[PDB]
mmCIF file of C-alpha atoms in Angstrom:
data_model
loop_
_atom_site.group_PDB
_atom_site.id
_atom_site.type_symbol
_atom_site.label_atom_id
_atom_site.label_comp_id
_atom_site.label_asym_id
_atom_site.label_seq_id
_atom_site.Cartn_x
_atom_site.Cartn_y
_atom_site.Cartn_z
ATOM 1 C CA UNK Z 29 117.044 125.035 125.590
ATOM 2 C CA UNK Z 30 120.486 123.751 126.219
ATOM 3 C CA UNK Z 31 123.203 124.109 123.044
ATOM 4 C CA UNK Z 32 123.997 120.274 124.129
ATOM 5 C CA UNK Z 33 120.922 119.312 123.292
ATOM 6 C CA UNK Z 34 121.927 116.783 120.131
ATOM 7 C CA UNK Z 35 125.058 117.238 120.025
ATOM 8 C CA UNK Z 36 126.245 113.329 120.279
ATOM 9 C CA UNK Z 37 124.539 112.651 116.845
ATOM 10 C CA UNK Z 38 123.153 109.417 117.904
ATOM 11 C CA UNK Z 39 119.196 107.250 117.451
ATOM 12 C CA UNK Z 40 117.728 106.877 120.622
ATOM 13 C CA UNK Z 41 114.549 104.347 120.303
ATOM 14 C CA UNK Z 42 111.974 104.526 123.243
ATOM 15 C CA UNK Z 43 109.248 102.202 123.951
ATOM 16 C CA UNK Z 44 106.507 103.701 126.244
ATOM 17 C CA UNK Z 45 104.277 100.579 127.826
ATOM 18 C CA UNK Z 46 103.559 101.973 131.240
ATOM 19 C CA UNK Z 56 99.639 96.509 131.942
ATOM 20 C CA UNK Z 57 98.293 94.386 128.978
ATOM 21 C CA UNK Z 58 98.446 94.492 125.219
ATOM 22 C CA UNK Z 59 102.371 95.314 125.008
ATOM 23 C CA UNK Z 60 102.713 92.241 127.304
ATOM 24 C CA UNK Z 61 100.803 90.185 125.404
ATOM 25 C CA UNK Z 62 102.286 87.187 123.905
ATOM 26 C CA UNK Z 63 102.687 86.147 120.057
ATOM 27 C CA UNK Z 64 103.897 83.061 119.305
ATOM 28 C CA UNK Z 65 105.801 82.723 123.041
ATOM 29 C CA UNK Z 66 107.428 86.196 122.372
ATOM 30 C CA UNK Z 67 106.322 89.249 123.867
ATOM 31 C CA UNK Z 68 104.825 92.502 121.743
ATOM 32 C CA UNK Z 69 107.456 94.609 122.933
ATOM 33 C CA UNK Z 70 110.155 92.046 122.635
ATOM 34 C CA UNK Z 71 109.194 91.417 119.286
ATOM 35 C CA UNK Z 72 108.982 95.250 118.735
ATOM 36 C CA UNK Z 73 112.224 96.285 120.639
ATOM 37 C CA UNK Z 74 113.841 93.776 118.089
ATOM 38 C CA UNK Z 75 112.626 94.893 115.305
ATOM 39 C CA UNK Z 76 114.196 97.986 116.414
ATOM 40 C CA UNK Z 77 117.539 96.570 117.267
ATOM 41 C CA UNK Z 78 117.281 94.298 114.393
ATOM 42 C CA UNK Z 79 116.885 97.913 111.937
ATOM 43 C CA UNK Z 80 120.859 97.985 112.392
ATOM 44 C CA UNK Z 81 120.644 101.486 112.622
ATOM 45 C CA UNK Z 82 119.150 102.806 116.263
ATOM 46 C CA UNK Z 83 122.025 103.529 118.927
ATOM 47 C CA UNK Z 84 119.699 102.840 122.090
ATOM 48 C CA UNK Z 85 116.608 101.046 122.566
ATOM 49 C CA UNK Z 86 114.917 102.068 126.036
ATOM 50 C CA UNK Z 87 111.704 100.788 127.218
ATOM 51 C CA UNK Z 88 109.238 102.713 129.722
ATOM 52 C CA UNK Z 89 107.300 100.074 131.661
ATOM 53 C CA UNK Z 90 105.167 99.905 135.073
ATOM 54 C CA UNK Z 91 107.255 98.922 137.595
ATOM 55 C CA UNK Z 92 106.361 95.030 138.445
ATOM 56 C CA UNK Z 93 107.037 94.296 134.943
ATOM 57 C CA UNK Z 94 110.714 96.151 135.274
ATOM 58 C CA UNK Z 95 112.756 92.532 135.911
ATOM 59 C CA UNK Z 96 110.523 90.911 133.837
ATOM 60 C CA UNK Z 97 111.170 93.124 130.741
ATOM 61 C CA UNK Z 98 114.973 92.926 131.432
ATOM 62 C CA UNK Z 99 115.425 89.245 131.538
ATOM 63 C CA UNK Z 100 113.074 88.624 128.219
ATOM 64 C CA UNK Z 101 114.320 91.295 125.815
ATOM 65 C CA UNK Z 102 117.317 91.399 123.135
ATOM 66 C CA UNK Z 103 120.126 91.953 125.594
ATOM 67 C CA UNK Z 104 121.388 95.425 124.362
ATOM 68 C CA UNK Z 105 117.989 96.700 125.148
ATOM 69 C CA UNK Z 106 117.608 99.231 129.097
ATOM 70 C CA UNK Z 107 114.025 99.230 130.887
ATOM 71 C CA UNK Z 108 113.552 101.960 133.278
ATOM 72 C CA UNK Z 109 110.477 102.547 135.085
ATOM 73 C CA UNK Z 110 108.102 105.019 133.395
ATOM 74 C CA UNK Z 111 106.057 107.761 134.231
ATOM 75 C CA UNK Z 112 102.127 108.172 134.141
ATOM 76 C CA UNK Z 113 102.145 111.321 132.020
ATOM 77 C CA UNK Z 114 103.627 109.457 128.734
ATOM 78 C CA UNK Z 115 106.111 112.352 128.055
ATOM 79 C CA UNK Z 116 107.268 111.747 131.570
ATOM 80 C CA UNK Z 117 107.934 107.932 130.336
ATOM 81 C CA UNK Z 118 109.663 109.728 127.154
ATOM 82 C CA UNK Z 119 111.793 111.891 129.751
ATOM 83 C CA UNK Z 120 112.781 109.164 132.087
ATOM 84 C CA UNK Z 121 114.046 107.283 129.188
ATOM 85 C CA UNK Z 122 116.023 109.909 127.627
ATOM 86 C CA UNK Z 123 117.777 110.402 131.119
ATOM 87 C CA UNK Z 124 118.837 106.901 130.760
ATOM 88 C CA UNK Z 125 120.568 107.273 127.552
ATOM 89 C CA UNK Z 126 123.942 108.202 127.628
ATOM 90 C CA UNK Z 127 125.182 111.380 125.821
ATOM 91 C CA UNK Z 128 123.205 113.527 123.965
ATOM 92 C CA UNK Z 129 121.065 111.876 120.588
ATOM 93 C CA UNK Z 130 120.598 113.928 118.305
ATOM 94 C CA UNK Z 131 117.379 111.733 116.999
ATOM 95 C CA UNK Z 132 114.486 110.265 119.403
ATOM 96 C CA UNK Z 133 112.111 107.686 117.622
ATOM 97 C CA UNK Z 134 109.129 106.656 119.825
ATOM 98 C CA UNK Z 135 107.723 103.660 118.822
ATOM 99 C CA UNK Z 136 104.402 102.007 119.613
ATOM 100 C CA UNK Z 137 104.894 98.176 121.664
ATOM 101 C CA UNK Z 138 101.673 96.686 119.888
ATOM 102 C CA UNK Z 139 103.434 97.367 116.524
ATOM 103 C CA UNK Z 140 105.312 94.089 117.060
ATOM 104 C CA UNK Z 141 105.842 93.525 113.739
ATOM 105 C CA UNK Z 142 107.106 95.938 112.063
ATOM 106 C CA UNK Z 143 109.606 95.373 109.534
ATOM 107 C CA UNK Z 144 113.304 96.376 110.185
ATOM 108 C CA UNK Z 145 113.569 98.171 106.638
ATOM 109 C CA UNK Z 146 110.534 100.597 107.670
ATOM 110 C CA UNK Z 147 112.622 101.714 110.857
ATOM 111 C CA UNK Z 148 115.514 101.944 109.163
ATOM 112 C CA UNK Z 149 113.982 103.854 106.281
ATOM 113 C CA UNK Z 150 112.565 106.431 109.368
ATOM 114 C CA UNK Z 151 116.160 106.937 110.461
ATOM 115 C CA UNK Z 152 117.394 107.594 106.861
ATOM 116 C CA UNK Z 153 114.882 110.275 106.305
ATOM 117 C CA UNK Z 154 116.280 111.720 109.706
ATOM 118 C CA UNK Z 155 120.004 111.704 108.092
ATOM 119 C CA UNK Z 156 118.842 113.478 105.193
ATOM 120 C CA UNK Z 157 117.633 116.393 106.995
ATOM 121 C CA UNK Z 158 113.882 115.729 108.344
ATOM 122 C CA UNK Z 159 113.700 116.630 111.463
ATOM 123 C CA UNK Z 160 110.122 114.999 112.088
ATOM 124 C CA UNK Z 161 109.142 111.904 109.920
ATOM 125 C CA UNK Z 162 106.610 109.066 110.592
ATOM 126 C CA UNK Z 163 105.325 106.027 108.580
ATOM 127 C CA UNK Z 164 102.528 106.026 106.579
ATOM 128 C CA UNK Z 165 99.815 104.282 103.787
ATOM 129 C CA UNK Z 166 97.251 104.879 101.591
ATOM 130 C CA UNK Z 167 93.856 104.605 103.124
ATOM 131 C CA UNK Z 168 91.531 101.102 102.442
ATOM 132 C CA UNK Z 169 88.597 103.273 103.092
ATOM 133 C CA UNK Z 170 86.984 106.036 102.308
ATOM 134 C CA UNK Z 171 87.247 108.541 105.732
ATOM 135 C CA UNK Z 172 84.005 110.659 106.374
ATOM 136 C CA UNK Z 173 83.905 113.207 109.203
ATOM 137 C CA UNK Z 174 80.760 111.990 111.561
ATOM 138 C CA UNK Z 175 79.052 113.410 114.434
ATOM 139 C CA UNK Z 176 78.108 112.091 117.557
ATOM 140 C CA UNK Z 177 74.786 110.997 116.572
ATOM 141 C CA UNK Z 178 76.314 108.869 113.260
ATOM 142 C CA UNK Z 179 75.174 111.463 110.925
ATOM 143 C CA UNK Z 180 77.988 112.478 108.257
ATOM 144 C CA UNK Z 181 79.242 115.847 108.344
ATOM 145 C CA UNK Z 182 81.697 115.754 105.229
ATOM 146 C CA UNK Z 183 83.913 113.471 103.084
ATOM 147 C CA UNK Z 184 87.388 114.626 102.882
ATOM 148 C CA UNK Z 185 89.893 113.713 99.462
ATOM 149 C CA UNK Z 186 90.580 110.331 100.478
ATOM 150 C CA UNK Z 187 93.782 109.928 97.739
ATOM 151 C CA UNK Z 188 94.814 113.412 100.046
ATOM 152 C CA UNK Z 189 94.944 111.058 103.341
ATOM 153 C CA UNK Z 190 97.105 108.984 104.932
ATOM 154 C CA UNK Z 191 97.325 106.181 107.455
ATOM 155 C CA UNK Z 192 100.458 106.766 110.245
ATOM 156 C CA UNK Z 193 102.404 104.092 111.656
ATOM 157 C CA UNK Z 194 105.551 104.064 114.404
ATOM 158 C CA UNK Z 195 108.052 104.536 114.779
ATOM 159 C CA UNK Z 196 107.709 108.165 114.602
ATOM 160 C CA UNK Z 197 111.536 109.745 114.344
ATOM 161 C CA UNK Z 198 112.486 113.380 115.448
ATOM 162 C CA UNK Z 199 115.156 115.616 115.912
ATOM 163 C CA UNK Z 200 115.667 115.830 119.940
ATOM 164 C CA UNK Z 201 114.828 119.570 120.429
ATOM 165 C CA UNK Z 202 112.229 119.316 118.278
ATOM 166 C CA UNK Z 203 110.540 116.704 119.980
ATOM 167 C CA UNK Z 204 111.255 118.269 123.317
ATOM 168 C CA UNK Z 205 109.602 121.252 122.001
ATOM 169 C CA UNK Z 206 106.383 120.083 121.146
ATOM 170 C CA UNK Z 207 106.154 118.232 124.689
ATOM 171 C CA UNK Z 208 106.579 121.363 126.653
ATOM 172 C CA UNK Z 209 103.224 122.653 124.502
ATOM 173 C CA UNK Z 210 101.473 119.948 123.969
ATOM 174 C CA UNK Z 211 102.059 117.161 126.856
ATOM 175 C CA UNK Z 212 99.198 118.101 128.772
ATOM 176 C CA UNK Z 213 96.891 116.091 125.761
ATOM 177 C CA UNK Z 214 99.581 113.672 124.447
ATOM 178 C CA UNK Z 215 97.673 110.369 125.210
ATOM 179 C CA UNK Z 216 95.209 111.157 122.893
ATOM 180 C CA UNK Z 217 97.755 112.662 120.150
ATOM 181 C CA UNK Z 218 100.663 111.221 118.165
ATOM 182 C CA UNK Z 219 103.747 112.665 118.750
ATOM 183 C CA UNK Z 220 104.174 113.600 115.463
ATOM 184 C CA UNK Z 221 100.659 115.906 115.967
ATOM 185 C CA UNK Z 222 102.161 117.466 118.760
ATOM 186 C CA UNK Z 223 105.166 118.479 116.587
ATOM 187 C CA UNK Z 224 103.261 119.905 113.762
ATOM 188 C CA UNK Z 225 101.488 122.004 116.623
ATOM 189 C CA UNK Z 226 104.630 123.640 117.160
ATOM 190 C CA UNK Z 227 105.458 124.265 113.934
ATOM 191 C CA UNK Z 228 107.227 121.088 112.891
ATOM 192 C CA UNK Z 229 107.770 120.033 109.331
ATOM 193 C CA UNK Z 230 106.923 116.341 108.656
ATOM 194 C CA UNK Z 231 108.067 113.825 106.342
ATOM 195 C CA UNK Z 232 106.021 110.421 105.208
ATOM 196 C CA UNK Z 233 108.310 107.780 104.167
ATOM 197 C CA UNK Z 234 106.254 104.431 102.772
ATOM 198 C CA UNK Z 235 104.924 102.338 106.059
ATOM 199 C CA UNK Z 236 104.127 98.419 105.868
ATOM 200 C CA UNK Z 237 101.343 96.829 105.999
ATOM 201 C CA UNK Z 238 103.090 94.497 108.929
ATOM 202 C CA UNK Z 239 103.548 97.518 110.798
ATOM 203 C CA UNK Z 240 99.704 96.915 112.172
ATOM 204 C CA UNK Z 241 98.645 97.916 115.383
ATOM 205 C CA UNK Z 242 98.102 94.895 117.011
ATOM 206 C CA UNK Z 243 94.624 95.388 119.061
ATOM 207 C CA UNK Z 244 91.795 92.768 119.023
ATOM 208 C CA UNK Z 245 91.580 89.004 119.303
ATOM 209 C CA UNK Z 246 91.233 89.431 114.828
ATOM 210 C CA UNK Z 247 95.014 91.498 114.897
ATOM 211 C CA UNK Z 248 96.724 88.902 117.106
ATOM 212 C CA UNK Z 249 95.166 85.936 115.451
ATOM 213 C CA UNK Z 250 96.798 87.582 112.001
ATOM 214 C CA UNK Z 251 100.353 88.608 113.566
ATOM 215 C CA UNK Z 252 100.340 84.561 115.145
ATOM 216 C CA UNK Z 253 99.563 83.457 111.845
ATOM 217 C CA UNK Z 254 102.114 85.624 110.305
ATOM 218 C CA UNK Z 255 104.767 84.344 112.565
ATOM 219 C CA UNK Z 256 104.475 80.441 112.333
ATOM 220 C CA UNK Z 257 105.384 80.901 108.717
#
């Protein structure tokens, strides 16, 4: 890979939503507008791009934080992840991917993803303590094992890496990333990862219960 690769030291923040649920509106704001601001609003990401389908292209530009880009993304995910990248200018040294529905998502966790990156992780995500108790399960229901709960954690976005590294684990892993976290296809290649402490507003905003919680959260 090329020696460039990095070398303008900057955050690059990508958005993949390429549709409903990131569209979906809280409170008369968007998911990812509230979630591209939270990103902007962090103080401390160089570039926010967002992936989107196409008819939502001119949309997404006229209704998110100015300082925010949209390109059109790809089907393959990583190919969203790509085309954004090749709208960034230079060469960022860090690439945080960040989910839409986790709209809201406190500023101080995304900084405190970045910060880790400074210190010298070169793959760190967002995480919590479990509520429950996780059992491995079969397909008919019956329980195959209980693993150490207090040994588990829950992962939130964004999820930060160094460029290369990230690029990396694409070329091996791509081919199953919309079932994986990025930070899974990482480890696969050998990857190091860091937890720093999530939020508990850092949800992942998917039924009718989550929205009803993140409106209620918002007219406070």
């Amino acid at each position: 890979l090329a020696p460039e690769t990095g070398s303008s030291g900057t955050v690059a923040a990508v958005v993949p939503a390429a549709i409903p649920k990131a569209f979906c509106e809280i409170d008369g704001a968007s998911m990812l507008a509230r979630a591209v601001a939270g990103l902007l609003d962090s103080k401390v990401v160089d570039h926010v791009v967002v992936a989107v389908p196409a008819d939502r292209v001119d949309e997404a530009k006229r209704l998110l934080p100015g300082q925010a880009t949209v390109v059109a993304g790809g089907a393959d995910r990583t190919a969203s992840v790509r085309l954004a990248l090749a709208a960034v200018p230079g060469n960022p040294a860090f690439v945080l991917v960040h989910d839409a529905a986790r709209a809201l998502t406190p500023p101080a966790l995304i900084a405190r993803v970045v910060q880790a990156l400074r210190d010298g992780h070169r793959a760190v995500v967002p995480a919590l303590p479990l509520h429950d108790t996780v059992k491995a399960v079969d397909a008919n229901g019956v329980v195959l094992g209980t693993p150490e709960r207090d040994g588990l954690r829950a992962v939130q976005t964004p999820q930060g890496f160094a460029t290369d590294l990230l690029l990396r684990a694409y070329a091996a892993g791509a081919g199953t990333a919309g079932f994986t976290d990025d930070a899974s296809l990482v480890e696969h290649v050998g990857g190091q990862v860091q937890v720093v402490d999530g939020d508990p507003l850092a949800f992942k905003i998917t039924t009718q219960l989550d929205l009803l919680l993140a409106e209620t959260i918002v007219r406070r």
